Amino acid sequence: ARVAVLISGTGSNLQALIDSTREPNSSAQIDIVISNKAAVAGLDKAERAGIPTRVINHKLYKNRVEFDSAIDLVLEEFSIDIVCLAGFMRILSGPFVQKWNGKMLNIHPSLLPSFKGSNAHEQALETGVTVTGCTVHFVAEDVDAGQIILQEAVPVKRGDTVATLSERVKLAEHKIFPAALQLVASGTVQLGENGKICWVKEEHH
Ligand SMILES: CS[C@H](CCCc1c(N)nc(N)[nH]c1=O)c1ccc(C(=O)N[C@@H](CCC(=O)O)C(=O)O)cc1
């Protein structure tokens, strides 16, 4: 499966994703990284790895649909099968999300449905949970909604700061984002017609 990663900044987890695709039995290749912001660190990561990049500036389009249609056209040109979001900071239009339904994935540094929105590590610490984690899900129109693919629990440790908890969750993300991509790329996990996750036994052995 040919994979695009959409970014707005540092492309957190992009290197984890790249490294995974270069493993022997990978079902995925990262074929393009698209940013809506020029000269961000995640583009340099992609470029250093020899992956094509594009920059699409939302300010050049009259509205969100026209902007997302420009993104889609690049994805079309590059024959992309699967999209991963890695810190993409523009809300994608209903028509875009619908088109890419069941083929676009993203990650959030909580055990959803807890700690929706920004600053989930601070939310966890403020709340005083002893277990948090990260969640990879299919992207839906509503932020943080969308069917869950994988989750991994991560402990909160007495004395943790936002920084120390964040690095522990990031280590889990580095594991589960590529694991989830491989599940979706191999076809092992697919989104059912009923809108629920389907774990598929594949014909080819
Ligand atoms: C990286 S945190 C999260 C990412 C949500 C992934 C997502 C997404 N990008 N689009 C849809 N429809 N559904 C989604 O789940 C998020 C939550 C909110 C925003 C948001 O309000 N963005 C604003 C402007 C943000 C900016 O670029 O400054 C907007 O697009 O108008 C952007 C991103």
PDB file of all heavy atoms in Angstrom, residues 110-116 135 144 148 151:
ATOM      1  N   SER A 110      -3.839   9.953  24.312  1.00  0.00           N
ATOM      2  CA  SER A 110      -4.646   9.462  25.436  1.00  0.00           C
ATOM      3  C   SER A 110      -5.291   8.160  25.023  1.00  0.00           C
ATOM      4  O   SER A 110      -5.235   7.771  23.848  1.00  0.00           O
ATOM      5  CB  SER A 110      -5.754  10.444  25.781  1.00  0.00           C
ATOM      6  OG  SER A 110      -6.793  10.426  24.797  1.00  0.00           O
ATOM      7  N   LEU A 111      -5.866   7.503  26.013  1.00  0.00           N
ATOM      8  CA  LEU A 111      -6.839   6.392  25.807  1.00  0.00           C
ATOM      9  C   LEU A 111      -8.193   6.999  25.557  1.00  0.00           C
ATOM     10  O   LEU A 111      -8.977   7.288  26.454  1.00  0.00           O
ATOM     11  CB  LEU A 111      -6.843   5.412  26.984  1.00  0.00           C
ATOM     12  CG  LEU A 111      -5.561   4.623  27.282  1.00  0.00           C
ATOM     13  CD1 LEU A 111      -5.650   3.770  28.538  1.00  0.00           C
ATOM     14  CD2 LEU A 111      -5.072   3.739  26.112  1.00  0.00           C
ATOM     15  N   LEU A 112      -8.484   7.250  24.286  1.00  0.00           N
ATOM     16  CA  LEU A 112      -9.757   7.832  23.960  1.00  0.00           C
ATOM     17  C   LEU A 112     -10.827   6.860  24.425  1.00  0.00           C
ATOM     18  O   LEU A 112     -10.604   5.631  24.364  1.00  0.00           O
ATOM     19  CB  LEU A 112      -9.877   8.077  22.469  1.00  0.00           C
ATOM     20  CG  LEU A 112      -9.031   9.228  21.944  1.00  0.00           C
ATOM     21  CD1 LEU A 112      -8.939   9.177  20.366  1.00  0.00           C
ATOM     22  CD2 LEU A 112      -9.606  10.541  22.480  1.00  0.00           C
ATOM     23  N   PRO A 113     -11.969   7.383  24.872  1.00  0.00           N
ATOM     24  CA  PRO A 113     -12.479   8.724  24.779  1.00  0.00           C
ATOM     25  C   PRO A 113     -12.073   9.727  25.855  1.00  0.00           C
ATOM     26  O   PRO A 113     -12.618  10.814  25.869  1.00  0.00           O
ATOM     27  CB  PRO A 113     -13.988   8.506  24.809  1.00  0.00           C
ATOM     28  CG  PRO A 113     -14.163   7.342  25.711  1.00  0.00           C
ATOM     29  CD  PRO A 113     -13.041   6.428  25.324  1.00  0.00           C
ATOM     30  N   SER A 114     -11.144   9.352  26.716  1.00  0.00           N
ATOM     31  CA  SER A 114     -10.618  10.320  27.707  1.00  0.00           C
ATOM     32  C   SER A 114      -9.750  11.356  27.040  1.00  0.00           C
ATOM     33  O   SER A 114      -9.040  11.053  26.084  1.00  0.00           O
ATOM     34  CB  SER A 114      -9.793   9.603  28.772  1.00  0.00           C
ATOM     35  OG  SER A 114     -10.591   8.744  29.592  1.00  0.00           O
ATOM     36  N   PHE A 115      -9.768  12.559  27.633  1.00  0.00           N
ATOM     37  CA  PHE A 115      -8.781  13.625  27.342  1.00  0.00           C
ATOM     38  C   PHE A 115      -8.718  13.945  25.845  1.00  0.00           C
ATOM     39  O   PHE A 115      -7.643  13.919  25.207  1.00  0.00           O
ATOM     40  CB  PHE A 115      -7.419  13.257  27.883  1.00  0.00           C
ATOM     41  CG  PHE A 115      -7.443  12.872  29.322  1.00  0.00           C
ATOM     42  CD1 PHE A 115      -6.763  11.767  29.764  1.00  0.00           C
ATOM     43  CD2 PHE A 115      -8.175  13.613  30.218  1.00  0.00           C
ATOM     44  CE1 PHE A 115      -6.807  11.362  31.104  1.00  0.00           C
ATOM     45  CE2 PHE A 115      -8.224  13.231  31.564  1.00  0.00           C
ATOM     46  CZ  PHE A 115      -7.540  12.103  31.992  1.00  0.00           C
ATOM     47  N   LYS A 116      -9.897  14.247  25.330  1.00  0.00           N
ATOM     48  CA  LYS A 116     -10.058  14.764  23.969  1.00  0.00           C
ATOM     49  C   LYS A 116      -9.406  16.121  23.891  1.00  0.00           C
ATOM     50  O   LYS A 116      -9.223  16.810  24.910  1.00  0.00           O
ATOM     51  CB  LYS A 116     -11.538  14.870  23.597  1.00  0.00           C
ATOM     52  CG  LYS A 116     -12.252  13.495  23.563  1.00  0.00           C
ATOM     53  CD  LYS A 116     -13.714  13.651  23.230  1.00  0.00           C
ATOM     54  CE  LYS A 116     -14.419  12.313  23.225  1.00  0.00           C
ATOM     55  NZ  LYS A 116     -15.889  12.534  23.358  1.00  0.00           N
ATOM     56  N   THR A 135      -3.827   6.278  21.421  1.00  0.00           N
ATOM     57  CA  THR A 135      -4.886   5.677  20.578  1.00  0.00           C
ATOM     58  C   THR A 135      -4.648   6.026  19.106  1.00  0.00           C
ATOM     59  O   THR A 135      -4.567   7.190  18.784  1.00  0.00           O
ATOM     60  CB  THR A 135      -6.250   6.270  20.932  1.00  0.00           C
ATOM     61  OG1 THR A 135      -6.521   6.072  22.340  1.00  0.00           O
ATOM     62  CG2 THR A 135      -7.391   5.576  20.100  1.00  0.00           C
ATOM     63  N   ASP A 144     -11.230  13.596  17.150  1.00  0.00           N
ATOM     64  CA  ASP A 144     -11.110  12.566  18.214  1.00  0.00           C
ATOM     65  C   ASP A 144     -12.167  11.442  18.134  1.00  0.00           C
ATOM     66  O   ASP A 144     -12.124  10.494  18.913  1.00  0.00           O
ATOM     67  CB  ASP A 144     -11.187  13.188  19.628  1.00  0.00           C
ATOM     68  CG  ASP A 144      -9.976  14.012  19.965  1.00  0.00           C
ATOM     69  OD1 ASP A 144      -8.855  13.605  19.581  1.00  0.00           O
ATOM     70  OD2 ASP A 144     -10.159  15.071  20.602  1.00  0.00           O
ATOM     71  N   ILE A 148     -11.586   3.102  16.634  1.00  0.00           N
ATOM     72  CA  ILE A 148     -10.289   2.755  17.193  1.00  0.00           C
ATOM     73  C   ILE A 148      -9.677   1.507  16.612  1.00  0.00           C
ATOM     74  O   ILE A 148     -10.320   0.456  16.474  1.00  0.00           O
ATOM     75  CB  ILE A 148     -10.385   2.672  18.767  1.00  0.00           C
ATOM     76  CG1 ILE A 148     -10.709   4.070  19.292  1.00  0.00           C
ATOM     77  CG2 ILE A 148      -9.141   2.007  19.344  1.00  0.00           C
ATOM     78  CD1 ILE A 148     -11.219   4.077  20.777  1.00  0.00           C
ATOM     79  N   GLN A 151      -4.750   0.626  20.768  1.00  0.00           N
ATOM     80  CA  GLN A 151      -4.454   1.432  21.988  1.00  0.00           C
ATOM     81  C   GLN A 151      -3.388   0.766  22.808  1.00  0.00           C
ATOM     82  O   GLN A 151      -3.242  -0.443  22.803  1.00  0.00           O
ATOM     83  CB  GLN A 151      -5.726   1.626  22.841  1.00  0.00           C
ATOM     84  CG  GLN A 151      -6.825   2.471  22.190  1.00  0.00           C
ATOM     85  CD  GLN A 151      -8.082   2.634  23.018  1.00  0.00           C
ATOM     86  OE1 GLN A 151      -8.787   1.653  23.345  1.00  0.00           O
ATOM     87  NE2 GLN A 151      -8.409   3.889  23.328  1.00  0.00           N
TER      88      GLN A 151
END
